[PDB]
Amino acid sequence: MQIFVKTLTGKTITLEVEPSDTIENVKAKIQDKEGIPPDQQRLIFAGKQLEDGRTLSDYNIQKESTLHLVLR
Amino acid sequence: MQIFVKTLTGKTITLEVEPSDTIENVKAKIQDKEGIPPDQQRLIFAGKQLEDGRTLSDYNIQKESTLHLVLR
Amino acid sequence: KYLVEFRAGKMSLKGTTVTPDKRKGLVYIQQTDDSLIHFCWKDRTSGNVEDDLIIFPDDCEFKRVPQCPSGRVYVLKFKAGSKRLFFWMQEPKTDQDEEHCRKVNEYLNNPPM
Amino acid sequence: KYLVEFRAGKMSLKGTTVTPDKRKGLVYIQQTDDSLIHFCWKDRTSGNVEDDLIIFPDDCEFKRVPQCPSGRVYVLKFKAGSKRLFFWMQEPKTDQDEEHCRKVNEYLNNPPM
Ligand SMILES: *[C@H](c1cccc(NC(=O)c2ccc(OC)cc2)c1)[C@H]1C(=O)Nc2ccc(F)cc21
Ligand SMILES: *[C@H](c1cccc(NC(=O)c2ccc(OC)cc2)c1)[C@H]1C(=O)Nc2ccc(F)cc21
């Protein structure tokens, strides 16, 4: 499935993922695409910071959902 | 009521308006706030360019709706 | 040229009853020189453009309608209002339906370059 | 300091039953030093922050729930999912309820500076 990742700078990322992908997996895909190391990434969806061990489906992240990426 | 006006490259504008305000009125409010002349403004909502003689309510623009502003 | 395109017809829920439009059509996305994204539908026979919507990120979702027995009914849904445009796929093959749906969403919600 | 604040309690739809939380509460919006916007609820008696949501533009709408006869029930609605947080106003006066609602939306969807 496809999701979008918005940043502060405002450039949005299109990612292809799976429902069973962990948040850690998604950060790894972001590193692959954008070169941002996972340990600098905060992913947020529906008001909450997403935990590495949990899946996209755990947070009910679906086809064409948008996540927010904040750099720390 | 409150609406938001997004621009292509720039900031979003918060406007206070009325349901009966014409699109021409809204462009005048944008001129008042931002100094952009009405004849340079294209307002878009739900896929369509908005006509000067019609009202916000005609287009079912409601509390806290977002319009898109494109500069000619 | 078109950034994305695929054969599809239009259709109306008149309420309870389901009225498909029989005409051969093409859904496509076009980026004009002002950089705006246009979601369009045209009649393939006449060439006339019937729908042309200027779409920005966060305006729209394009998704399959699960309730349709066909499996090839899709809706352009405006997230804010209740504006809905329904389409039925006319591509001879079905293997790219899900890909076409993803591409629509990509170019509407995050057009590259 | 708080960018927006007002007295309000929390409440749950348990399906078909309304369950109001009777505790004295404060809804507020706070912008932290990283510039992120936080929608919060705290217990005014204890001072404990129970809700703290990081909100961006186009995530949320804050609006009155018209079905509630009270007239002072508001919902923080996430446009994407089905996440809903309900609140009942506890301000002694009612004349700023609509203004408080506008201010929430302003700072969530278009925070100044
Ligand atoms: C879905 C729905 C239910 C029953 C029948 C149909 N019709 C078609 O899918 C169809 C028939 C024939 C042709 O070729 C001419 C094309 C398509 C559809 C309902 C639904 O649940 N939601 C919905 C929304 C919009 C619609 F137009 C129809 C449906
Ligand atoms: C609205 C609703 C319908 C019936 C009754 C109430 N209750 C309250 O307004 C209320 C009662 C008592 C107090 O303080 C003790 C506070 C508030 C509400 C429904 C609705 O239509 N949607 C909804 C959503 C969430 C809710 F909690 C209630 C409602």
Compute the distance between CA of residue C44 and CA of residue D54 in angstroms, rounded to an integer.
47
Q: Say if D44 is an interface residue toward chain A (CB within 8 Å).
A: no
Domain with residue B61: its CATH number is 3.10.20.90
DSSP conformation class of C94: S
Enumerate the residues of chain A whose CB falls inside 8 A of the CB of residue D39.
47
The 3 state secondary structure assigned to C39-55 is EEEEECCCCCEEEEEEE
What does the block give as tokens for D63?
């609006």
Compute the distance between CA of residue B22 and CA of residue B34 in angstroms, rounded to an integer.
18
Q: How many domains is chain B built from?
A: 1
Ligand 2: residue of D12, D16, D18 to mutate (most ligand atoms within 8 A of CB) is D18
Whole-angstrom CA distances from C106 to A23, C38, C75, C84, D54 are 21, 13, 15, 19, 25
Parallel/antiparallel/unpaired status of strands D37-43 and D17-20? unpaired
Compute the distance between CA of residue D111 and CA of residue D97 in angstroms, rounded to an integer.
20
What is the structure's resolution, reported in angstroms to one decimal? 2.1
Compute the distance between CA of residue A34 and CA of residue A71 in angstroms, rounded to an integer.
13
CA B36 to chain centre: 12
Sorted by where each starts, the structural domains of chain C and their CATH numbers stand as 1-110 (2.30.29.70)
> Is the Cβ pair B2, D102 closer than 8 Å?
yes
Compute the distance between CA of residue C1 and CA of residue C97 in angstroms, rounded to an integer.
21
Compute the distance between CA of residue D103 and CA of residue D87 in angstroms, rounded to an integer.
15
Q: A17 is in which domain, residue-wise?
A: 2-71
What does the block give as tokens for C19?
């009225």
Q: Concatenate the DSSP letters of all residues of chain A into one string.
A: -EEEEEESS---EEEE--TT-BHHHHHHHHHHHH---GGGEEEEETTEEPPTTSBTGGGT--TT-EEEEEE-
Strands (E), D1-113: 4-14, 17-20, 25-31, 37-43, 49-55, 60-64, 73-78, 84-89
By C-alpha distance, the chain B residue nearest C39 is B47
Ligand 2 centroid, distance to D85 Cα (angstroms): 12
Angle, vertex CA D56, rays to CA B21 and CA A60, nearest 5: 115
Q: Say if C53 is an interface residue toward chain B (CB within 8 Å).
A: yes
